[PDB]
C-alpha cells in the first residue's frame, strides 16, 4: 500500500469512485497477478491492468511476435517482430506505467512449474488458445485456490468466465473480451462489485448481443 503524491494524482479518477477510494487503489498496488498468453487477449487485458495500477504483473508466453499478430496485438510492433512476446510486451507496458513491476517469463512450463508459479500470485488470467494449457491452469488454480479469470475469442465470438472455487478473428473482438477480463480481475482484487463467477457471458459480434448462461457442477 502507501501511494505517493504522484500515484495519488494519476490514479485519481479511480480513487474517487464510491466504494473504491484510497483503499482500492492500495489493494491494486499490492496485487500480484499472472497473465498467461501475451497474444491477442493477453495484450488487451494487460494494457488496462497496467494503467489501472496492479503493482506486479508476470507475463508468461513462449512465442515470438510476427506480422499477422500486428492486426490486433497493439502492444507489439513491426520493430519487435521476431523478438519474444513477453519482452515486446513488457517494454510497451512499462511505457504505459513506470510505476508497476513487470516480470517476463519466456517459456513453456509444465504442471510442476505452473503449480509453483500460481501459488505465488493472487489471481491468474487465462489468455491462451488451447485446452491443454487451459486445463493445467484450471487444475493448478483449483488446487491452490487462486481465482481464475478465463476468456476466449475467435472469428466473431467471445466468452468470459470467473472461477472463485485457421479461423479468422476481427481485431476489436479481442478488445471487448480482453477489457472484460481486466475489469473482472480488478473487481476480485479489491472486493469491488460482484464477480461473474457461476456463469459464462457470451458475446456475439455479428449481431452485438450478450447472453448469460448458468453453470453446473
Amino acid at each position: 500500500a502507501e501511494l505517493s503524491d504522484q500515484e495519488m494524482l494519476r490514479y485519481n479518477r479511480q480513487i474517487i469512485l464510491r466504494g473504491f477510494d484510497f483503499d482500492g487503489q492500495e489493494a491494486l498496488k499490492d496485487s500480484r497477478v499472472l497473465i498467461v498468453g501475451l497474444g491477442g487477449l493477453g495484450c488487451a487485458a494487460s494494457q488496462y491492468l497496467a494503467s489501472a495500477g496492479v503493482g506486479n504483473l508476470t507475463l508468461l508466453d513462449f512465442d515470438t511476435v510476427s506480422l499477422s499478430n500486428l492486426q490486433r496485438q497493439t502492444l507489439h510492433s513491426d520493430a519487435t517482430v521476431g523478438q519474444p512476446k513477453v519482452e515486446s510486451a513488457r517494454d510497451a507496458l512499462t511505457r504505459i506505467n513506470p510505476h508497476i513491476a513487470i516480470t517476463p517469463v519466456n517459456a513453456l512450463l509444465d504442471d510442476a512449474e505452473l503449480a509453483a508459479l500460481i501459488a505465488e500470485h493472487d489471481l491468474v488470467l487465462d489468455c491462451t488458445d488451447n485446452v491443454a494449457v487451459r486445463n493445467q491452469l484450471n487444475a493448478g488454480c483449483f488446487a491452490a485456490k487462486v481465482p481464475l479469470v478465463s476468456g476466449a475469442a475467435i472469428r466473431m465470438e467471445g466468452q468470459i468466465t470467473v472461477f472463485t472455487y485457421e479461423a479468422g478473428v476481427m481485431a476489436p473482438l479481442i478488445g471487448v473480451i480482453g477489457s472484460l477480463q481486466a475489469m473482472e480481475a480488478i473487481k476480485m482484487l479489491a472486493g469491488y462489485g460482484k464477480p461473474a463467477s457461476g456463469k459464462i457471458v457470451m458475446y456475439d459480434a455479428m449481431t452485438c448481443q450478450f447472453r448469460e448462461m448458468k453453470l453446473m457442477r
Binding site: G37, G39, G40, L41, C127, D129, N130, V131, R134, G151, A152, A153, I154, R155, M156, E157, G158, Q159, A167, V169, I174, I177, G178, I200, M202, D204, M206, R211, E212, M213, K214, L215, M216
Partner: protein, 81 residues
C-alpha cells in the same frame, strides 16, 4: 413448443436464428442428430464435438431430458485469443 435458438457461427451456417420443432427427443443428443441429418451444411453446423448445448439459460450435458416447452440454444465453443 420447442424454441430451438442458434447463436454465433452456428446460426451463421444454418441461416436461421430460431426454429420451433415438434416434441420428439429424449436426450439433447436426440435432437442433435435429427437437425444434423438435414443437410451437409446442417451436419457440419451441428457436428458432434464442435457444439455446445444450453437448456433454458443453463448449460447441460448432451443428455439433459427434453420435454415440451423447452428452449434449447445451440452455440459453438470458443478457445483462442
Amino acid at each position: 413448443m420447442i424454441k430451438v435458438l442458434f447463436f454465433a457461427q452456428v446460426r451463421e451456417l444454418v441461416g436461421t436464428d430460431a426454429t420451433e420443432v415438434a416434441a420428439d427427443f429424449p436426450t439433447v443428443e436426440a435432437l442433435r442428430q435429427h437437425m444434423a441429418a438435414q443437410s451437409d451444411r446442417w451436419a457440419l453446423a451441428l457436428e458432434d464435438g464442435k457444439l455446445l448445448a444450453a437448456v433454458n439459460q443453463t448449460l447441460v450435458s448432451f443428455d439433459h431430458p427434453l420435454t415440451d416447452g423447452d428452449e434449447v440454444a445451440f452455440f459453438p465453443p470458443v478457445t483462442g485469443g
